[PDB]
């Protein structure tokens, strides 16, 4: 039943909120130091962003928990915008602390936050630029160049331009969501970089070799696919038993009756409807012997992320048994084709009755380039999907961020009062974001930032410091391309995510 | 006192000191609250919703202290919330600021047998002329802006910006469906929390609104015999998977047999109990689901006590576990029952409309409860203030615009009377500025600036501050002719009740 | 471990003042109500000299004796416990000073005797015979109520006080053991102190409001079973044979429906009408189906009105306790012109009143039922004990310290013996007498000597019984005012002082006894 009142708790709230932003300071452009974080569970914990470690960190603070949840409120929407919100609202809170000693504490606190955050979105949608199917691009040529935005921005190679169209394929196929939970991507070690692939359904990286695995079909044009969340192995149904002998005739039997059931278990789906049986869990010898006795496909230990998207793709269901199951709970494609790619026994699933899954298959022939592009795929995905969703496309990299705080430095003159201080703090927050990607561009922030300000006293269309080019210039014409929608989103967060707890300098906690 | 033994938490110094001290320090909330404020309190009763509040009642619910007064005094403050929803963020700071006024006189040595009297005497003198400074009244309660005007101090007092639509929404709620003839009900008209949409989308859906899912069908007939059951369907005997594949192909069936034919007789006697809607405090089994639809019984897959309570309250229900053929002692109250999509969520809607027992229900749509509760808090304290059961609220100047009015009343009357109470009465003419300061604080100026310029307005009735730029430099927001008004009811109480608290709390030495 | 001579004697006078230091803030209308959240651990409020003691758990040995002697006083009085405690340590001050100037405690006490006499004799010498009248009784009422509470709420308590005192005189009882009945009532305001000419009954029934308004009562107060039991018992409990339990359960319900149908026979025999109510009142509970069978016929069947009710019902109503319904007459029952089942707050409080030959006329106090309502519940009772004495004595002297400037000053004028051996106890005695008149007078910001010299001389001049105004600490005339000291009250506190003031004075050594 504990509280700290006044400014002392208020200011105490910001650092707990700020320190996590000091991590993400630039985690979007990734460069910095990344420490592998092993929590008290023995779990090595890392991220491609700020949010996942934020997901991992917990606080007794409501404050430090809010912007967490807020950055998470921004996170799961776009899959991005976390670090942005993570920095900005904390930056506000970071900057008002000296003001807090002067005091902002009157509820002249909360006003200029959201009052000036509309000025941004007032500037956003007026400078916003919309993209279409015939417009400058197929909208695939956009999602190309927005992949060439998102994929290429981090390095890699002209496959980034090749993937730029290739990633858009399953995108266009599945485009509903902002993200890939229907799409997914298959990492392929082997082949080469220049060829990466896409399947109109799930395509299993590897299914797993058994006794009779070669003697079981790797190919079906009519897969009726038992989609198993559950294993069938020698351990699944025991072969161990015994029986009394004054005659040894029963040694064959007491094992054989159990043997029949391992058979019968897998066979009963096999007999009912099943050709293909995909288990995400082991298949052992004596079971797969009957699966090899069946020679209607056996799988085990296979990815469920593919197997449940196989349910998505096929129309069958993830099966918690091999029994009690119908022929409809079976997955279905017009293609079961296993042609091993590298070490991956590679199941083609396509021709599905629905094919809610269409998965891009990234093939590198090497490990490094892929996971860099696979990380850039999420980039492309989070963008190229959203580039369709909101066709109005703002530009990042201090495009408006320097252009907003430009006016939002210019907006200071008309304010004066207690919140003109906020206006300056609100302004340069926009510019504290590129204030890193400057360093990621190798640039000094401030001079570059001040240039950009001068460059926004000269230019100011898309101009900004782009770690994309490591230059300072128009972002949207630099192919810095993300929809203008996330801006309002972040800016609805930015000023407002800060104003929550600064509305509270008296924060009560209880044991109960 | 002179003993190693006996007892006390109060007395001597302490009565003069500790009993006045923390009771004041309680006011920090009400010092920042009651009237437009952006200032809030994150109060964590650890619910995993970290609760923004300015409402003293649920601020003081956690607060526990050895000071017997501050221990007690929250009573009168909560006894206040019972009587009026608004004015409660007023209660704690006014007396709390009015307290140490006497303690300064105690430093002067003005007796406890003396000072509080003048307060009490001017507590009279207030409540003497306090009804004289009544101006308006909230008359037609179906009308929006006679109701939303009272609301426009009350929710405003709790919270500032959201107030306006709320006041509309609450008046559009028509808590006047209760004729307010002496009739008002907090459960029948209820808040129903809906995650998402807008809080501008937060509406009033009349009936009983349960965000819990209507399962399967809707009621057979709209005057239901409403089956409200804590555990009608827990499952009878559940299925298993043994081998991390299947247990046995043979063992599967017998448990569905017990499940089905029981839940046959179960839901058949949910049909034989005549239930048109079966309302399940626990889960539902798909068999009983199938049975609930065949036997034609509206099914509610899950129910919080929020349902079950109001169900027991409204329906006359008793939420019951059932593995057995049931009987309804619940019956219905309701003349209507539905699945409606409200919050654009499929919702269990029990419904009817009357004057009395009538359920006409707020449905709040907000991304969280901290949204839909503290605002509800802000909301319902106007809904609570709507509860007068004198239909005309006798609306005084709102926003505490009667402060400056009584202030010169009491200070002139403090001039009249002689003796140490003349100070106490003039001290009673003081604590008025607390909320004008509490406003001017969250607004950012001193009440002096405010109140002296409102000592320049002398008799005004209209102008008083808040949270706004008008409340800072101009020292003026027009709180009588406003749209922002408050009843005389909470005026009758808070000035007297916060006094009733402050009466004996200096007297208590042990 | 021991404390020799003055040490154990220092412990005596030490603890005494904090008691009084409570009383200087606890005495009279000048005194202040004391909330104790510590004392018993309970959350409390009190004004009295006796009650604040016992409420505390008191660890000091000197104070282990102290809650004892005011108890028997507060029994009789209700006031003067707020006073007697003052004079004792005020006497312990003097007695200390005289051994501080050197003396034995014996040659101290020796002078108490004639001083105690002449003052106890002055009790006779002063004693004001006041014809005991609701007006005068209001005054003796409110003075103890003002002593403990607001003069406002004193007069609020005074009525119900002076109400039931003439009503217990109606019972020919000079003391009061009945119509002492103080009924807490669930309310938003303790402001209401009322009188019920008959009881306030507890449970109308678990099936409520059967006949809620009974304007002619035929009262059967019956410890019988209309709830015998409806539940599962074999011999009356759970036996080892489960099948043998429910065999007797129906006959348990049937023996109820024995008594139920007897009422259908009885209400018929008694009433034949819902107009003049036949009233079942059960010391046990009553089955709702008993209630239902009775309620629909216009019968009110009360359950679990306590044994105090079973008496006062049988008593106040001219009622009866008849433990078999069977068939009975209305005159086989008592009668009350009002039985009304009344809900303010949670419980429905059935008011059986206009009770013929009332042996209990209930004093209603509405309120939150807090220590607050208790705070007006004790003063009334205390004020009741005061007017009880005011009924007891035909002589009540003024209050407000008017007695001692008549009493002490005389003993201040003269050693009763006019010899020094008395002076040793007379200086101590006559001094300690003036604490009550001086304390609240000085508590009001009015120096005692200047305040006393008036009220002293104002008695010396006028021969007047001359009071203090307890809030304004000024000389007043308490003969007219109504602050008035029962001859019963004031006498024992003198003894209560003396009896406890000698041995503790005479004990110079203390030691751990085990």
From Swiss-Prot, chain A:
* Residues holding ATP: 29, 81, 84, 386, 397, 487
What Pfam family does this protein match (any one)?
Answer: Cpn60_TCP1
Q: Does the keyword Hydrolase apply?
A: yes
Provide the binding site for Mg(2+).
Answer: 80
Could you say which EC number(s) this protein's record lists?
A: 3.6.1.-
Supply one GO molecular-function term.
protein folding chaperone
Sites of N6-acetyllysine modification: 55, 238, 308
The record, for InterPro entries, names: Chap_CCT_eta, Chaperone_TCP-1, Chaperonin_TCP-1_CS, Cpn60/GroEL/TCP-1, GroEL-like_apical_dom_sf, GROEL-like_equatorial_sf, TCP-1-like_intermed_sf, TCP-1_chaperonin
Q: Which reaction does it catalyse?
A: ATP + H2O = ADP + phosphate + H(+)
Cross-link Glycyl lysine isopeptide (Lys-Gly) (interchain with G-Cter in SUMO2), residue numbers?
418
**GO BP annotation list:** binding of sperm to zona pellucida; chaperone mediated protein folding independent of cofactor; chaperone-mediated protein folding; positive regulation of protein localization to Cajal body; positive regulation of telomerase RNA localization to Cajal body; positive regulation of telomere maintenance via telomerase; protein folding; protein stabilization
Broad enzyme group? hydrolase
Q: What function is annotated for this protein?
A: Component of the chaperonin-containing T-complex (TRiC), a molecular chaperone complex that assists the folding of actin, tubulin and other proteins upon ATP hydrolysis. The TRiC complex mediates the folding of WRAP53/TCAB1, thereby regulating telomere maintenance.
- Disease involvement: De novo genetic variants in nearly every subunit of the TRiC complex, including CCT7, have been found in individuals with a broad spectrum of brain malformations, and clinical phenotypes ranging from mild to severe epilepsy, developmental delay, intellectual disability, ataxia, and other features of cerebral malfunction.
**NCBIfam families noted in UniProt:** chap_CCT_eta, thermosome_alpha, thermosome_beta
Oligomeric form and interacting partners: Component of the chaperonin-containing T-complex (TRiC), a hexadecamer composed of two identical back-to-back stacked rings enclosing a protein folding chamber. Each ring is made up of eight different subunits: TCP1/CCT1, CCT2, CCT3, CCT4, CCT5, CCT6A/CCT6, CCT7, CCT8. Interacts with PACRG. Interacts with DLEC1.
Similarity comment text for this entry:
Belongs to the TCP-1 chaperonin family.
Q: What is this protein called?
A: T-complex protein 1 subunit eta
From Swiss-Prot, chain B:
Cross-linked sites for Glycyl lysine isopeptide (Lys-Gly) (interchain with G-Cter in SUMO1)? 446
> Which residues get modified to N6-acetyllysine?
305, 387, 453
Q: Which reaction does it catalyse?
A: ATP + H2O = ADP + phosphate + H(+)
Cross-link position per record: Glycyl lysine isopeptide (Lys-Gly) (interchain with G-Cter in SUMO2): 211, 241, 247
Phosphotyrosine PTM positions: 17, 492
Alphabetically ordered keywords of this record: Acetylation, ATP-binding, Cell projection, Chaperone, Cilium, Cytoplasm, Cytoskeleton, Hydrolase, Isopeptide bond, Nucleotide-binding, Phosphoprotein, Ubl conjugation
Compartments annotated for it: namely: Cytoplasm; Cytoplasm, Cytoskeleton, Microtubule organizing center, Centrosome; Cytoplasm, Cytoskeleton, Cilium basal body
The record's Pfam families line, in alphabetical order, gives:
Cpn60_TCP1
Q: What is this protein called?
A: T-complex protein 1 subunit theta
Source organism of the structure: Homo sapiens (Human)
From Swiss-Prot, chain C:
Q: What is its main location?
A: cytoplasm
In this UniProt entry, the residues modified to N6-acetyllysine are: 188, 276, 354, 366, 377
GO MF, one term, reads: WD40-repeat domain binding
Subcellular localization is given as:
Cytoplasm
Question: What Pfam families would the database entry show?
Answer: Cpn60_TCP1
Q: Where does Mg(2+) bind?
A: 79
Q: Give the record's family classification.
A: Belongs to the TCP-1 chaperonin family.
Protein name listed in UniProt: T-complex protein 1 subunit zeta
């Amino acid at each position: 039943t504990d509280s700290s009142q006044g400014i002392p708790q208020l200011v105490s709230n910001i650092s707990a909120c700020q320190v996590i932003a000091e991590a993400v300071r630039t985690t979007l452009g990734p460069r910095g130091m990344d420490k592998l974080i092993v929590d008290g569970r023995g779990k090595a914990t890392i991220s491609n962003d700020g949010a996942t470690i934020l997901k991992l960190l917990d606080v007794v603070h409501p404050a430090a928990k809010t912007l967490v949840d807020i950055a998470k409120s921004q996170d799961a929407e776009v899959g991005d915008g976390t670090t942005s919100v993570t920095l900005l609202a904390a930056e506000f809170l970071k900057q008002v602390k000296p003001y807090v000693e002067e005091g902002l504490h009157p509820q002249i606190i909360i006003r200029a936050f959201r009052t000036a955050t509309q000025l941004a979105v007032n500037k956003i949608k007026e400078i916003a630029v919309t993209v279409k199917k015939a417009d400058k691009v197929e909208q695939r040529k956009l999602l190309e160049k927005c992949a060439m935005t998102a994929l290429s921005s981090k390095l890699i190679s002209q496959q980034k331009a090749f993937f730029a169209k290739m990633v858009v394929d399953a995108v266009m196929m599945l485009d509903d969501l902002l993200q890939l939970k229907m799409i997914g991507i298959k990492k392929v070690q082997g082949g080469a970089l220049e060829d990466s692939q896409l399947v109109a359904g799930v395509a299993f990286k590897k299914t797993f070799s058994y006794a009779g695995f070669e003697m079981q079909p790797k190919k079906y044009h009519n897969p009726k696919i038992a989609l198993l969340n559950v294993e069938l192995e020698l351990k699944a149904e025991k072969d161990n038993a015994e029986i009394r002998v004054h005659t040894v005739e029963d040694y064959q039997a007491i094992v054989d009756a159990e043997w029949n059931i391992l058979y019968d278990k897998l066979e009963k789906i096999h007999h009912s409807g099943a050709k293909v049986v995909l288990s995400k869990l082991p298949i052992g010898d004596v079971a797969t012997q009957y699966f090899a006795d069946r020679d209607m496909f056996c799988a085990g230990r296979v990815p469920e992320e593919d197997l449940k998207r196989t349910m998505m793709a096929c129309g069958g269901s993830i099966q918690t048994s091999v029994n009690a199951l119908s022929a409809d709970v079976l997955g279905r494609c017009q293609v079961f084709e296993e042609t091993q790619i590298g070490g991956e026994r590679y199941n083609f699933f396509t021709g599905c009755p629905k094919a809610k899954t269409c998965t891009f298959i990234l093939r590198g022939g090497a490990e490094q380039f892929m996971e860099e592009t696979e990380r850039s795929l999420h980039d492309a995905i989070m963008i190229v999907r959203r580039a369709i969703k909101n066709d109005s496309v703002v530009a990042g990299g201090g495009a408006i961020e320097m252009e907003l705080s430009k006016y939002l430095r210019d907006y200071s003159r008309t304010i004066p009062g207690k919140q003109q201080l906020l206006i300056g703090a609100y302004a340069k927050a926009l510019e504290i974001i590129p204030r890193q990607l400057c360093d990621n561009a190798g640039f000094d922030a401030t001079n570059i930032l001040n240039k950009l300000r001068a460059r926004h006293a000269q230019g100011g269309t898309w101009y900004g410091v782009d770690i994309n080019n490591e230059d300072i210039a128009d972002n949207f014409e630099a192919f810095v391309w993300e929809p203008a929608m996330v801006r309002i989103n972040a800016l609805t967060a930015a000023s407002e995510a800060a104003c929550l707890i600064v509305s509270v300098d008296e924060t009560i906690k209880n044991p109960r | 006192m002179l003993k190693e033994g006996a007892k006390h938490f109060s007395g001597l110094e302490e009565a003069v000191y500790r009993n006045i001290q923390a009771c004041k320090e309680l006011a920090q909330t009400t010092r920042t609250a009651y009237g437009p404020n952006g200032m809030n309190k994150m109060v964590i009763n650890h619910l995993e919703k970290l609760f923004v509040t300015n409402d003293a009642a649920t601020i003081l619910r956690e607060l526990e202290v050895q000071h017997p007064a501050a221990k007690m005094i929250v009573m009168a403050s909560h006894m206040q919330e019972q009587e009026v929803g608004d004015g409660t963020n007023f209660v704690l700071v006014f007396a709390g600021a009015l307290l140490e006024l006497a303690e300064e006189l105690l430093r002067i040595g003005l007796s406890v047998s003396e000072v509080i009297e003048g307060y009490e005497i001017a507590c009279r003198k207030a409540h003497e002329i306090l009804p004289n400074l009544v101006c308006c009244s909230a008359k037609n309660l179906r009308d929006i802006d006679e109701v939303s005007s009272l609301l426009r101090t009350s929710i405003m007092s709790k919270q500032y910006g959201n107030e306006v639509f709320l006041a509309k929404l609450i008046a559009q709620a028509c808590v006047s469906i209760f004729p307010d003839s002496g009739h008002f009900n907090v459960d029948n008209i209820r808040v129903c929390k809906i995650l998402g949409s807008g809080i501008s989308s937060s509406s009033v859906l009349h009936g009983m609104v349960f965000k819990k899912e209507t399962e399967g069908d809707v009621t057979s007939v709209k005057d239901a015999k409403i089956a409200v059951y804590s555990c009608p369907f827990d499952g009878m005997i559940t299925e298993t998977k043994g081998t991390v594949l299947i247990k046995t192909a043979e063992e599967l069936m017998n448990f569905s047999k017990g499940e089905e034919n029981l839940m046959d007789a179960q839901v058949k006697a949910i049909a034989d109990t005549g239930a048109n809607v079966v309302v399940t405090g626990g889960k539902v089994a798909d068999m009983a689901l199938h049975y609930a639809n065949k036997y034609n019984i509206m099914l509610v897959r899950l129910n919080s006590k929020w349902d079950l309570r109001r169900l027991c309250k409204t329906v006359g229900a008793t939420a019951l576990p059932r593995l057995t053929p049931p009987v309804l002692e619940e019956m219905g109250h309701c003349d209507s029952v539905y699945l409606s999509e409200v919050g654009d969520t499929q919702v269990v809607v029990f419904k009817h409309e009357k004057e009395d027992g009538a359920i006409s229900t707020i449905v709040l749509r907000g991304s969280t409860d901290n949204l839909m509760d503290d605002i509800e808090r802000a909301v319902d304290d106007g809904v609570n203030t709507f509860k007068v059961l004198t239909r005309d609220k006798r609306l005084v100047p709102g926003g505490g615009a009667t402060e400056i009015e009584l202030a010169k009343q009491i200070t002139s009357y403090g001039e009249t009377c002689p003796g140490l109470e003349q100070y106490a009465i003039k001290k009673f003419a003081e604590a008025f500025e607390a909320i004008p300061r509490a406003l001017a604080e969250n607004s950012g100026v001193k009440a002096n600036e405010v109140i002296s310029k409102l000592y320049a307005v002398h008799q005004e009735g209209n102008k008083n501050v808040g949270l706004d730029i008008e409340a800072e430099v101009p020292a003026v927001k027009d709180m009588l002719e406003a749209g922002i008004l408050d009843t005389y009811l909470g005026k009758y109480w808070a000035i007297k009740l916060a006094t009733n608290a402050a009466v004996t709390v200096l007297r208590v030495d042990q | 471990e021991v404390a020799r001579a003055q040490a154990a004697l220092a412990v005596n006078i030490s603890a005494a003042r904090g008691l009084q230091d409570v009383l200087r803030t606890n005495l009279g209308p000048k005194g202040t109500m004391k909330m104790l959240v510590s004392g018993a651990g309970d959350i409390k409020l009190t004004k009295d000299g006796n009650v604040l003691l016992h409420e505390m758990q008191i660890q000091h040995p000197t104070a282990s004796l102290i809650a004892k002697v005011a108890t028997a006083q507060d029994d009789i009085t209700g006031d003067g416990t707020t006073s007697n405690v003052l004079i004792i340590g005020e006497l312990l001050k003097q007695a200390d000073l005289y051994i501080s100037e050197g003396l034995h405690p014996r040659i101290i006490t020796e002078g108490f005797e004639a001083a105690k006499e002449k003052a106890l004799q002055f009790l006779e010498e002063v004693k004001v015979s006041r014809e005991m009248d609701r007006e005068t009784l209001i005054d003796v009422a409110r003075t103890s109520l003002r002593t403990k509470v607001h003069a406002e709420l004193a007069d609020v308590l005074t009525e119900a006080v002076v109400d039931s005192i003439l009503a217990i005189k109606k019972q020919d009882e000079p003391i009061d053991l009945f119509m002492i009945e103080i009924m807490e009532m669930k309310h938003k305001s303790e402001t209401d102190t009322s009188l019920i000419r008959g009881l306030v009954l507890d449970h109308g029934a678990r099936h409520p409001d059967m006949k809620k308004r009974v304007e002619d009562a035929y009262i059967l107060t019956c410890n019988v079973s209309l709830e015998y039991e409806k539940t599962e018992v074999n011999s009356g409990f759970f036996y080892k044979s489960a099948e043998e339990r429910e065999k007797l359960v129906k006959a348990e319900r049937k023996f109820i429906e024995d008594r139920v149908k007897k009422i259908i026979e009885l209400k018929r025999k008694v009433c034949g009408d819902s107009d003049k109510g036949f009233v079942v009142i059960n010391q046990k509970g009553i089955d709702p189906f008993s209630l239902d069978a009775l309620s629909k016929e216009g019968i009110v069947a009360l359950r679990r009105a306590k044994r105090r009710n079973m008496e006062r019902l049988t008593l106040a109503c001219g009622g009866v306790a008849l433990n078999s319904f069977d068939d009975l007459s209305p005159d086989c029952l008592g009668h009350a012109g009002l039985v009304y089942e009344y809900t303010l707050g949670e419980e429905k409080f059935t008011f059986i009143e206009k009770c013929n030959n009332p042996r209990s006329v209930t004093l209603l106090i509405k309120g939150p039922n807090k220590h607050t309502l208790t705070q007006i519940k004790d003063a009334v009772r205390d004020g009741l004990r005061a007017v009880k004495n005011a009924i007891d004595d035909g002589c009540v002297v003024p209050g407000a310290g008017a007695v001692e400037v008549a009493m002490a000053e005389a003993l201040i004028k003269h050693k009763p013996s006019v010899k020094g051996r008395a002076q040793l106890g007379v200086q101590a005695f006559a001094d300690a007498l003036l604490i009550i008149p001086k304390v609240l007078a000085q508590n009001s910001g009015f120096d005692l000597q200047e305040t006393l010299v008036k009220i002293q001389a104002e008695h010396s001049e006028s021969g007047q019984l001359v009071g203090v105004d307890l809030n304004t600490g000024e000389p007043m005339v308490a003969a007219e005012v109504g602050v008035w000291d029962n001859y019963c009250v004031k006498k024992q506190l003198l003894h209560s002082c003396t009896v406890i003031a000698t041995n503790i004075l005479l004990v110079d050594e203390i030691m751990r006894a085990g």
